[PDB]
């Protein structure tokens, strides 16, 4: 009713083409096909066997329209270190979420320390069920609120530090 969507990964026509740093070997676009053969465009990284990971993935520029306070809803799934065969002392079961406020919608190389940290996201009590035909994905669902924003728009970023993450859906919205 009063929700205005500022970004929905599930609705974007074609590739997301967010920005992965690193560009190869970190976050990669993986397409899970729903019953109609419509891509569901996920972002995944699972280098749990390999130390000192620092993999970033950021969105396109997102306009805030009028709003100071935005809401971020992520549906994801994490492989617990417990369930992954291998000796892996640097395995992790969270990722970090960041934002960068910019008037410039073609920011190219925004640096790590310009990003401002929202939270560490973990698989927790809340989940959802997304029926895609052949399967039902059971996924974690977390929402965070960021603000107060005061620039034409912003960038979201997800940092991986040694986890096995699938980000299946990212919606960003505000309440009008």
């Amino acid at each position: 009713g009063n929700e205005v969507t500022l970004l929905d990964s599930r609705s974007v026509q074609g590739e997301l083409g967010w920005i992965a740093s690193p560009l190869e070997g970190g976050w990669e676009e993986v397409s899970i096909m729903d019953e109609k053969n419509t891509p569901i465009r996920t972002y995944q990284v699972c280098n749990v066997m390999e130390p000192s990971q620092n993999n970033w993935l950021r969105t396109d520029w997102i306009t805030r329209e009028g709003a100071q306070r935005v809401y971020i809803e992520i549906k994801f799934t994490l492989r617990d270190c417990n369930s992954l065969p291998g000796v892996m002392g640097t395995c992790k079961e969270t990722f970090n979420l960041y934002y960068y406020e910019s008037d410039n919608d073609k920011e190219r190389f925004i640096r790590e320390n310009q990003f401002v940290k929202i939270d560490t996201i973990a698989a927790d009590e809340s989940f959802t069920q997304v029926d895609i035909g052949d399967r039902i994905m059971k996924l974690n669902t977390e929402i965070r609120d960021v603000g107060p924003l005061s620039k034409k728009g912003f960038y979201l970023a997800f940092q991986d530090v040694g986890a096995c993450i699938a980000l299946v859906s990212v919606r960003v919205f505000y309440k009008k």
């Binding site: 990669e28 993986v30 899970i32 996920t42 995944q44 990284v45 699972c46 280098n47 749990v48 066997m49 799934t77 492989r79 992954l84 065969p85 291998g86 052949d134 399967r135 994905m137 096995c164 699938a166 299946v168």
Partner: peptide, 12 residues
């Protein structure tokens, strides 16, 4: 490569 890939279920 990724050790595991989420496709429906995780595949490692």
């Amino acid at each position: 490569a990724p050790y595991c890939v989420y496709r429906x279920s995780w595949s490692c």
